[PDB]
Design a protein around this ligand. Sequence first.
Ligand SMILES: CC(=O)N[C@@H]1[C@@H](O)[C@H](O[C@@H]2O[C@H](CO[C@]3(C(=O)O)C[C@H](O)[C@@H](NC(C)=O)[C@H]([C@H](O)[C@H](O)CO)O3)[C@H](O)[C@H](O)[C@H]2O)[C@@H](CO)O[C@H]1O
Ligand SMILES: *[C@@H]1O[C@H](CO)[C@@H](O[C@@H]2O[C@H](CO)[C@@H](O)[C@H](O)[C@H]2NC(C)=O)[C@H](O)[C@H]1NC(C)=O
Ligand SMILES: *[C@@H]1O[C@H](CO)[C@@H](O[C@@H]2O[C@H](CO)[C@@H](O)[C@H](O)[C@H]2NC(C)=O)[C@H](O)[C@H]1NC(C)=O
Ligand SMILES: *[C@@H]1O[C@H](CO)[C@@H](O[C@@H]2O[C@H](CO)[C@@H](O)[C@H](O)[C@H]2NC(C)=O)[C@H](O)[C@H]1NC(C)=O
Ligand SMILES: CC(=O)N[C@H]1[C@H]([C@H](O)[C@H](O)CO)O[C@@](O)(C(=O)O)C[C@@H]1O
Ligand SMILES: *[C@@H]1O[C@H](CO)[C@@H](O)[C@H](O)[C@H]1NC(C)=O
Lengths: 175, 175, 175, 322, 322, 322
Amino acid sequence: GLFGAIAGFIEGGWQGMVDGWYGYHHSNEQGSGYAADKESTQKAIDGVTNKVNSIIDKMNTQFEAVGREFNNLERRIENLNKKMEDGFLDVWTYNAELLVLMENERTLDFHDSNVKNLYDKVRLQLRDNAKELGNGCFEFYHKCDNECMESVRNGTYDYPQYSEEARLKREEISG
Amino acid sequence: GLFGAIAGFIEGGWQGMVDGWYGYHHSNEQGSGYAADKESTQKAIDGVTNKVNSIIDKMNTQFEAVGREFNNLERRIENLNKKMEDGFLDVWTYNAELLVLMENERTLDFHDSNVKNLYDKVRLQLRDNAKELGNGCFEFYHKCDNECMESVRNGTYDYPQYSEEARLKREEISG
Amino acid sequence: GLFGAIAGFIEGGWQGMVDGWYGYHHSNEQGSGYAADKESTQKAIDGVTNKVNSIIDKMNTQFEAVGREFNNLERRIENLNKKMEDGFLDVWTYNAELLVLMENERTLDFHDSNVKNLYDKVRLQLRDNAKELGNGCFEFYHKCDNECMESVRNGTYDYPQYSEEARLKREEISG
Amino acid sequence: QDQICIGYHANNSTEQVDTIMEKNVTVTHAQDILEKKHNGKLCDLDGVKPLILRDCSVAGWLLGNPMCDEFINVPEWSYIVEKANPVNDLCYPGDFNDYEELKHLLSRINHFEKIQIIPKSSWSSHEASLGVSSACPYQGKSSFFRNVVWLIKKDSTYPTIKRSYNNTNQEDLLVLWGIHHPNDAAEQTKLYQNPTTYISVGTSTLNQRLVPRIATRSKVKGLSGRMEFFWTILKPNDAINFESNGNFIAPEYAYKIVKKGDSTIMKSELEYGNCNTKCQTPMGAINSSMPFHNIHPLTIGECPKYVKSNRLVLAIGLRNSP
Amino acid sequence: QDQICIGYHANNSTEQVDTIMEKNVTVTHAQDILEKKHNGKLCDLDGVKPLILRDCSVAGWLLGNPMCDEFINVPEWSYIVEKANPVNDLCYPGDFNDYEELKHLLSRINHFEKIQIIPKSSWSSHEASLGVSSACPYQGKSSFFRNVVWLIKKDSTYPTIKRSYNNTNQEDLLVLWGIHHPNDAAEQTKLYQNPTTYISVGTSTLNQRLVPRIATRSKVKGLSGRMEFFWTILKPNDAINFESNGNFIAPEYAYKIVKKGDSTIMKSELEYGNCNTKCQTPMGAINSSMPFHNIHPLTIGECPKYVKSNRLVLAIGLRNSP
Amino acid sequence: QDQICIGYHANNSTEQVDTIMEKNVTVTHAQDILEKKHNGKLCDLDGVKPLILRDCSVAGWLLGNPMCDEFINVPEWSYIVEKANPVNDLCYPGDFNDYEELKHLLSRINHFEKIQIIPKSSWSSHEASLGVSSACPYQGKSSFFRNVVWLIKKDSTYPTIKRSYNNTNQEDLLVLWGIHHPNDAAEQTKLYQNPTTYISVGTSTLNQRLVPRIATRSKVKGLSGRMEFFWTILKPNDAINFESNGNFIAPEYAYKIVKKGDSTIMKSELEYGNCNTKCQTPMGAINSSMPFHNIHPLTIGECPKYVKSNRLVLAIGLRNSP
Ligand SMILES: CC(=O)N[C@@H]1[C@@H](O)[C@H](O[C@@H]2O[C@H](CO[C@]3(C(=O)O)C[C@H](O)[C@@H](NC(C)=O)[C@H]([C@H](O)[C@H](O)CO)O3)[C@H](O)[C@H](O)[C@H]2O)[C@@H](CO)O[C@H]1O
Ligand SMILES: *[C@@H]1O[C@H](CO)[C@@H](O[C@@H]2O[C@H](CO)[C@@H](O)[C@H](O)[C@H]2NC(C)=O)[C@H](O)[C@H]1NC(C)=O
Ligand SMILES: *[C@@H]1O[C@H](CO)[C@@H](O[C@@H]2O[C@H](CO)[C@@H](O)[C@H](O)[C@H]2NC(C)=O)[C@H](O)[C@H]1NC(C)=O
Ligand SMILES: *[C@@H]1O[C@H](CO)[C@@H](O[C@@H]2O[C@H](CO)[C@@H](O)[C@H](O)[C@H]2NC(C)=O)[C@H](O)[C@H]1NC(C)=O
Ligand SMILES: CC(=O)N[C@H]1[C@H]([C@H](O)[C@H](O)CO)O[C@@](O)(C(=O)O)C[C@@H]1O
Ligand SMILES: *[C@@H]1O[C@H](CO)[C@@H](O)[C@H](O)[C@H]1NC(C)=O
């Protein structure tokens, strides 16, 4: 991927998460489970939906009637028409096919980017209170119960509150 | 954004910087102020300008005369002309609209990317002489006067020269 | 570049590496040399090749015969033909030129991105066992022989195995 | 000791997508942008039903070819449907002058009403009842087109016709007439009496003089004679003046016409299907919002762009690998 | 404590831009790629002024319809402007044969010069001064087209005309003539004497033979007769030969013609505006460099692509949320 | 202090590429997508060789203009090559009715075979050997088109011709005939005897009656007479019936025709080059796989898209700055 996330370090999707596009898995003392980031996910849905809708809605359609109305002493004109129809067919086919390829690429990269951005968001929250494993997972140096992890997601993680405990484990697990 | 910079960690633009597109703010003992990175900025301007100019200049324009020259016993030919004009109108409209959309997206992402690249450039200069706050700002562990900060921008920061002083402050900062 | 790699911190290409697009240079006790990352490189080749092939294959071509069949009392029809041919010429020219520009931009940025992603992969492997010089090179704090470096490339670097030796070397140079 | 992991959605879907750089990438969700479905029926177009001629051609329907179904008055239509090769065209062989332009003119009609312009009963110096052919069979027997009258000499004379009709209606009038080209001089004398003969037609705009062409011709339906038909649009308050010496196929019925837009003649073998659309195809209507289709080139209405493609799938979700 | 921060430009601008994935993104600077402005004037096209016919049609101008402003020797033009429905067309009612092809031919002309081909004074066996009509008034008097002569019998005779003109000029000649179709035999006899009559015209290329059509017609301008006009291009060193029995509307003036390119006839109600352009619209000229416009479909010149859009705004600066 | 570095390929290549944001970016490898090369020859098109008319026009070749090469029968072709201004067209001056539609019809032919339809020796009441002109020289002698016969009165009489030909072949038949327009009544009398004359031609579909037009004309090749040619397609088991009083240019040879597809007439000065292609240009053939070309607009076959561009270079490798 462009952002090395989706098929890079996070080497795989979770069938367990079904309530969103991007989100979290956790395992503590209290149990393990999935949660979904409703913000990044809904923003993504809005984005992609808008993209589809705009590939659809920007097309001007007007009445036309086609059309074989020339006789056998008007074949030159008939050929002019053929050239025109064939021309437009070529233009539209090439354009549509390429547009789909290009925008599909952009879409997958957009997903990649969203994932990576969520990752870095969490990473900036935790710093040295946890270790990066390199698979999109953070091994906590302190004790993070359900309330703590919901604070990680919510963007409300209290770094100094665990910094010492972590510092012990670190500077004891790094022992 | 694709590069999580512009509306990601640097959550907002500076009205104070008016002499460029991307750059710096500083606050030391001697005072606070804005400076602009004239290299990343001018390269960006050249890029975008070239983009606009090339969307404009690649267009072939030739003389045409249009055109209602068919009489009321030539309405089949008249209809052929209509289908042609309408065809081109649809082609050009769809292409122009989509081109604008696509390239606008690319432009904003280009800005995002430039910002992020400036950030990482500085980050690689400073290392542990400063702390990343996570808002595009670096809190210095040592004393960085005007000459020092101009050296950060210029790409001429002397890391070992402050590494110890920084190392001390870093130390006293923890326990 | 978008990803600040190719003409950013890695300020130049290696004529010494000829067996791939992206890869490694090393210098140890045992000698200095080039190796190429065959995974990022072949993925890139498949990508770009697919891009070219798809710009080529999406084009619908059908039989046409053109064509000056109208006499000197049919010059209005002849003019209708001319406007059509001219029309398609302008359309195809503009589209082909812009398509080439746009996709070329995308291709170079893709290279940029692949390079940057390789860099960050190595960076995440090594952490503090090595120093980032800021030119796409990592100065090792420990001793990395051929086997060790092949383990850096292979994605099989044993960070704890050298962490202490590195840790020793580390605090030293700092005064 | 505890973990926080970042990851992304996955499922069992097999929806595939192509990419500029990669083919057959399994993906979480996808949307096709290409319309491939039609209802197999002939429908109204924006609320207006089509004129469906069954085994009748436009010419056969306008002149009233006896073997065409009896003129039901459709006062309005959005397009015309003809079969590829309609069986009932011109029952007496010949031609329609400017026929394709006439069909195009009639392809969409805001108002259409057949009226009697010159009663048959009004030809007192000519036979109006013997103008009949076996090639034009009706109610058992030798007949003729119903809207138009084949005049023949009465006793052994064909005095000069001078007849005029003033369009006192409030709408344009489609007027039709014809000329008969016989096989030889003998037939010319037998039907009309005068050997050298003409038909002149005059309007504010039309200045026409038709002369029959005698020539030896192949039999078509057993006949060597030919009938050639002509037409104009008579404006409100204009008159049309006919003068003729013989070989005149006179108007009887004409049509009030109101034209506001244009379409075309659709060639299709289908039947009406009591529906409505914005886009009609000869294979069936399209219920559309998609910007592209691959049904058929020959469409009428506000249609998506015709394309040569079986598939235009946009990725919406993400890579859904095993 | 000390800080270094990275950031980007912002301002108070409200320029908005759309994006494939997002709408109405406020941005630092933007550039529209769509031309929407025109000068509301009729201008020269690449340095060449148009032929502006005021209330005159092309036919009315070429034949010199008396009520058309007096012959503007414009020797050169790049396009022709006509009003939608010009008041002064054919003063005597009738038709121009191959009219639209003639208008297209004349739409852009490199050199034009009216010259006298057959002096009026040269019809000694025929009346050249009585060919006058109240439908063609010059100043309350009955007149006629000025470039063409309505010949009438002299005393009670119309001897056969045989007249030839050899194009000794160095350029093609546009030659115009006509035939008069009367209302009845009596008028035929009154104007020309001969009852059965013709006009033959011959060139290296042209082999024409015109016969008048008598028919009863509606009055137009109170007249039932009709005038039908015809034209050729006579090559240098070719001759044109007229022979006629009556109903001849003879050339007097013809035109030297040099044609190098082609344009079209613009329908517009505007007036000349002493400017210059590369792209003319009926609503006004376009000073262009933009690749697209939305002014009007009917353009002449080197014009940007017509498009159905009110806005094509390229983002140049950056997101400017404030 | 040992090192590991990451980097990318470079070389001495000077291949340049343009980009949306940057121009003239030197790069490692590139591929042009635009075809610029042609072989300068006329070739077969998908295995079928073209009918190359040398200094002959289609009309000249079909009627057999004596000065056109006589060659062995080409039974099949894919397109027709004519020179811009072929020297041998109609040796006797005149016209071909519906000529361009005939050329279009003939442009691609699946089967063509000339056959004798009416033997010359079969005109016993007319002279078939004096129909000869200095404007149609064969070997220093006055001759005529070879495929068609100019009948003249025998002794001082031209009895009425009634001749018919039934197409008993299994293919459509292209039939050609003509009418002669003389300069005056005297010539009319000298050649044919009858002063007032006609040619009628009838088919299951054709109903034609031609009358010569006498007019005074300029000399072309020293001649003031004109010859006008017509044609039909006679279906299998249909007959064609000619009747004529004089001025008849009778068929002698006709052509069996099988048509399966269509092309056009290519104007080119080149010569055959014993090759094959899918795409032929008047400047030479294109060996193509590229989607675009800039050779010439006037192509026949399966060709890439014509474009106004000298260069369409795709970046494949990477930036190769020094
Ligand atoms: C005097 C007489 O009746 N003549 C008879 C021949 O005509 C006849 O040969 C047959 O000709 C048939 C044509 O008959 C028609 C027709 O269309 O049905 C008869 C129509 O009544 C007549 N209509 C009018 C207004 O005259 C019509 C008309 O003359 C032509 O269509 C004009 O071109 O002729 C038919 O073609 C048969 O195929 C053919 O056998 C023979 C045998 O009956 O006897 C004659 O007495
Ligand atoms: C058709 O008949 C109508 C009605 O009689 C004619 O219309 C009138 O014509 C007279 C002059 O002849 C005028 O005084 C009336 O004012 C006309 N009425 C309208 C509403 O136009 C008409 O002229 C006849 N048309 C022709 C061609 O003879
Ligand atoms: C128009 O007039 C010119 C000049 O008289 C004619 O050209 C001459 O034709 C004669 C007759 O054979 C030639 O012998 C001369 O050599 C020609 N002179 C020139 C300048 O070419 C011309 O033929 C006339 N056109 C017609 C059709 O009569
Ligand atoms: C052309 O010749 C054919 C061959 O004889 C004619 O066809 C025959 O018509 C007779 C009736 O007179 C039938 O007995 C045969 O069945 C016919 N043969 C075929 C194959 O149809 C044909 O009518 C002639 N065409 C014309 C227009 O005269
Ligand atoms: C069949 C015939 O009699 N041909 C003679 C013609 C005709 O009188 C005219 O061409 C008719 O227009 O005139 C010639 O001068 C010619 O053309 O060579 C002599 C020629 O033998
Ligand atoms: C490509 O996609 C089509 C549709 O899913 C599938 O039939 C085919 O097997 C795929 N090709 C490959 C590479 O397997």
